[PDB]
Design a binder for these strands. Sequence first.
RNA 1: GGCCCAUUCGGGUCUUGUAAUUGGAAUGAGUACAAUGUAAAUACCUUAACGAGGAACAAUUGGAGGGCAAGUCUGGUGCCAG
RNA 2: UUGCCGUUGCUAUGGC
Lengths: 454, 102, 171, 74, 229
Amino acid sequence: NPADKRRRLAKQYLENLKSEDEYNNFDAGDLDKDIIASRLKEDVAEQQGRVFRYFGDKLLISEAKQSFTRVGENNLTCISCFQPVRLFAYTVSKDLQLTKYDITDFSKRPKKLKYAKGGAKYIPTSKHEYENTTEGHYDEILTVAASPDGKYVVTGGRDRKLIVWSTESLSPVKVIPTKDRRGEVLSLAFRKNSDQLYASCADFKIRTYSINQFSQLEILYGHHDIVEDISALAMERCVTVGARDRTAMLWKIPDETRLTFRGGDEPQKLLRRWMKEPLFFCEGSIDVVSMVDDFHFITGSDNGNICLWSLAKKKPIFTERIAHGILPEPSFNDISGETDEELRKRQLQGKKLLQPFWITSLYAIPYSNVFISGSWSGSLKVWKISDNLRSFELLGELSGAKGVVTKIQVVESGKHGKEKFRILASIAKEHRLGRWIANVSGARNGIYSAVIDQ
Amino acid sequence: AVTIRTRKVISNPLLARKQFVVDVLHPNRANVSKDELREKLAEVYKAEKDAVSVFGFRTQFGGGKSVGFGLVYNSVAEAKKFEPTYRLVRYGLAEKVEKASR
Amino acid sequence: YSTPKRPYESSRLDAELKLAGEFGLKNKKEIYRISFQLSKIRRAARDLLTRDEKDPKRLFEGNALIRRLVRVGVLSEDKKKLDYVLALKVEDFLERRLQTQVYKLGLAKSVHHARVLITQRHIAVGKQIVNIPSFMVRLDSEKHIDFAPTSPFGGARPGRVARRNAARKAE
Amino acid sequence: GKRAINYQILKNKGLTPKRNKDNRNSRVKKRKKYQKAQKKLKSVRAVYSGGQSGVYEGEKTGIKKGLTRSVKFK
Amino acid sequence: AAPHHWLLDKLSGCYAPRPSAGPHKLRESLPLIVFLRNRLKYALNGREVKAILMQRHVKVDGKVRTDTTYPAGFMDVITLDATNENFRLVYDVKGRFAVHRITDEEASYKLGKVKKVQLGKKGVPYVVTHDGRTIRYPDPNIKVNDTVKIDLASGKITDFIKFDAGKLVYVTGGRNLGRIGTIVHKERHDGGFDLVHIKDSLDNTFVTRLNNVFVIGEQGKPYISLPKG
RNA sequence: GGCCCAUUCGGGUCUUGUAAUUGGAAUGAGUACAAUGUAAAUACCUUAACGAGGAACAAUUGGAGGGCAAGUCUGGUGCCAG
RNA sequence: UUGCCGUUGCUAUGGC
C-alpha cells in the first residue's frame, strides 16, 4: 500500500529528526527571548485577540425592529459606519452619489445629511493614466470606508481612483489614482483603530495607504483573479479573497508574505459520503470575507457556501453548504416555447439546472460570536459560532430586506452584559459589480436597518 | 511623501535609550534622506532631534522600502556620551581628526 | 551547459533553426543550456522508472519531481505520472521563459518586440522589473506579467523621445 | 595644437571585406534566416496557412488534372 | 573558538572573549561581555558594554566589579540597578547557562559547595567555595560537598545544607551536566564514579563524580527558585 | 518574379522583392545630480538631468563563388587554351 | 423615509 508506506516512512522520518515530562523543563534560549519579551514595548496593536465576546445565544433574535428605509438611488453598493471610543453612516451608489447619514438616533430610521454626487463633469481631459487627479467620480463608485477615528471617509470604484473626503463637509481633500488601466478598486478596509487603509484592486493587487499622511505604504501582489473582498482587524495582518481562483490569502503586510487557503469540495466524494446511506456540488468562486478574530475567519462562496477557516489549517474547518436556498427554477412559460407542458417540463431536465443563491454579503462582528449573511433570498441570516470554534449554526432570520444585500455591518449600543445593535444592510436590486440578476422579486433600493436587543 | 514605520520597540535603561527597526517607505523617491528621516522620527517621537539617530540603512531591490536601525535618546548630553564618535561626526557636532603620520 | 554529441548534423541544424526562429533566441547556447538541464531532469526520471513500485526513492523523489515540475509549469496539474517527465522536451521548457510569455499574453507583437520590451525594462512580473528574457516564469507568476508602472506603456510619464518631440512641437 | 589620432589608427580594422548589418546582430540574423526558411517551406510542402479567409475565390494559381501528389503504398 | 555553555551564535566574529582570572575557572563561567552584549542584549558592541561598565550598573554578588571579562560562574547573582534586574544564572539540561530572573529576597544570598575544611594557622576553622569565599568559623560537621549559604551583605554563612542520602543535588560536570532529580540511587565508590544518582521523567539513572555535583536543597523545598517551561 | 528538387531533359510551387521613400514611439551603453553605504573612501543597492538614426553611439572571424581593362605573362594546327 | 410616479398614514408599503 503506497500511501500507507508514505505515511509510515514520513513518521519514521520525523522520529529520526526528533532523535537528531521531567521536573526540570527550562530552556535557556526560550527564557532569554522571554526576558526580551518582558523588556519590549507595544503590547497594543499586535494582540492575537481570540473570541472574547461570547454572546450568540444570549441576545434576542426573532423580534427585531426592522425598518427598511427606501432611498431614491439606483443600486446602492456599499455601507460604511463609525463609532468613537453621534454616529455617522455612509452609503454610495451606482448613480455616482455618496450620502452621509446620522444613525445614532437608535430607535428610529436613519437620517439623511449630505449628498456628494459625481457625474460626467469629472471625466478627465486627458485619457492618460497618471493625470487622473480630478476631484470627483465619473464611473461606478464601488466602495466606501470610514476612518476609525472619523476625520475622513475614503471611497473608490471603477474610475480607478481613491478620493478621500472629509467627514464634516463631504469635500474631496485628496485624490490618489491607482496609476494603471485596470486598477479598479473593489474593496476597502481600514485596520481597526488606525489611519491605514487596505484597498484591493483588480490588478491582482492590494494597495495600502496612510490616509492622514496622504501616502501609499506598500503594494502587495499575489492573487490570481480579481481581489473581490478584503477584511482587516487591529493587527497589521489582512485577509483578502480573489474571486475565481478559489483561494483566500492572508497577508503579513510588513513581512509581505501570505498564507493561502484553497477550497476543495468535490461532488464525487460528497455524493459518495451521502451514498453510504442530495443536491450539493462543487464551488464556483469565493466572494466575501470577514476576519472574525486573529485566528479564524469566514468566507462566502458562489454556490452558497459559508465556510469557517482557521489560521492553522489549509483546508477549511467547517462548511455550510446551502446558506440561503436554491433559486426558483425558470417557469415553463419562460423556458421552452413549445405548446405542451410535457415538453416544456422536459426542458427543465429535472433538478440539473437549479442554481443556489450566492452569498453576496458576509459580516463577522469583530471578536464576537455571531455573523450575518445576506443575498437575494429576501431574508438575512444570523449565525453564531460555537464556543469550541469548530462550527457555526443558524440562530434566526431577518426577513424584511427584499433585494440583493450588497453590504452588511452592525452598529453597537449598550454595556458589557446588556447590548443592542442595529444591523445595517444596503439593499439593491442588482449585484454590486455587474448586473447579472434577473427575477427582481419585489426588491427596492434601500437601507435595511434592524434593531436587535438584549 | 516619505512614510515611516517603527517595529520591535524595546527600552534600554542601561544606555538610557529606546531602540527599534525602521521600515522607511519612499514610493517614487530615491532613498531615505537620513536628515529628513531624523526630523520625521524626532517629530513622531518626542523632540530630542540631536538625540535621535539611525545608522543601518539597506534599500531593497527596486526601491520603495529600506530597513534601518533606529535608536532614540532622551538627554542629548547622554546621547553624546553613548553614541560613537564616527556617527557624531556624521550627524551631530563632534569633529576630532586623527594625526596623519607614518 | 554542454555541447551535444553530434553537433552539426542537418536535423540538429534545422532543429536549432526552428527553435531560435520560433522563440527569438540569440544563439545556440539558450537551447543547449535548457536542454542540458532537461537532460539531467529526465535522466533522473529514467532511473526513477527503472526502480520499482513502493521503492522509497521512487515514491518520494517521484512525487517531489512531478510537483516541482508542475510548479515550474512545464507539466500540467492532471498528469501526475512519472512517464510524462520522460515525454517532456525542450520547447516545453522554453515556452516558459518570459519573452515567450510576454508575446503569448499579448503585451508584445512578436517575440522580438517581447525581447526588447524585457531588455528595456517595461515588463515586471509581480513587484520586480525583470529585465533578462530567459526567466522561466512559474505557474503563479504566469498571471502577473504586466507592464511596469515605471514605464510609458504602463501609465507612467512618457520617455525622452516623446517629451522632446512634445517640447519641440511646443516650440 | 593636439594632433589627435583617428579611427583607422585607433580601431585598426585593417582591410576587411564588406560585411553584413544582419551579421552585426546574432539575433536579427536568425530572425531573417528563419523567415527565409519558412518562405522556402511553402515551396517544398503545402503549408496550412489558416483556412478560408473570406469568400472562396478559387484556387488562384491553377489546377493540374494530371499531377497526383499523394504517397502510394509500397 | 567558543565553548558550548555560552549559547553563542556562530555569526558573531572571529576572536572569542577569553574571560579574565577571577573566582571561577575559565571552563565553568561566562564573562560580562558575552552576558550583557549577546545573550540578553543590553549592548550592541564592546564599546558600549564598556561604557555601561564604566557607568557601573552591574552589581554581581553585591559588589560592582567593573570589568568586561569578569568570569561569572555558577549562580553569581548578577544585579543591575536600573529596572531592578536580579539574575541568578544556573545550568539548563543541555549544557548552557540558563539565566533565571529572581527577586530581591532571593538575590540577597547565594549558596556554595564547600571544597575543604582546614586547620590552617592559629586554630581557625576554615571553609572555601567555588568563588573562594574564605569565611570564618563554621560548625565542625561541615564535610566536603555540603552547601553553605552566603550572607551577601557581610560574608557569613547563614544556613547550611548537609550532604547525605536524600538531598536535592545539582550536577555541574561530565556527561550529566545540568540535571535535577537527585534520587534513584546512592553509590559512594572509593575513587571514581561515586555519587548520588538522578532521576528523569521516567526516572532513569545516571553516573557522575562527587566534585561534579553539589546540593541545592531538599526533596521538594529548595529555597532557590528555579525556572520552568 | 522569387524559391525547391534533379546526372540529364526538365519538373514542383507561390506574395515576393527593393543601398525605394517615410513616420512617430522605446530605451540602453555613455555623460552625470545626489542620497545611501562605509572609520573614511570604492563598489553593490536607490536615483532626478542629458543621451540614436550611417540609430557613425561605426562586433568580428572563417568559408564558397564570380565578374571586369585599348592591362600583363605563357603555350600553339587564325579569333583559342591557360 | 427618495429619482419619479400609486396606494398614501394624519405611518408603512409596490411598480417602473
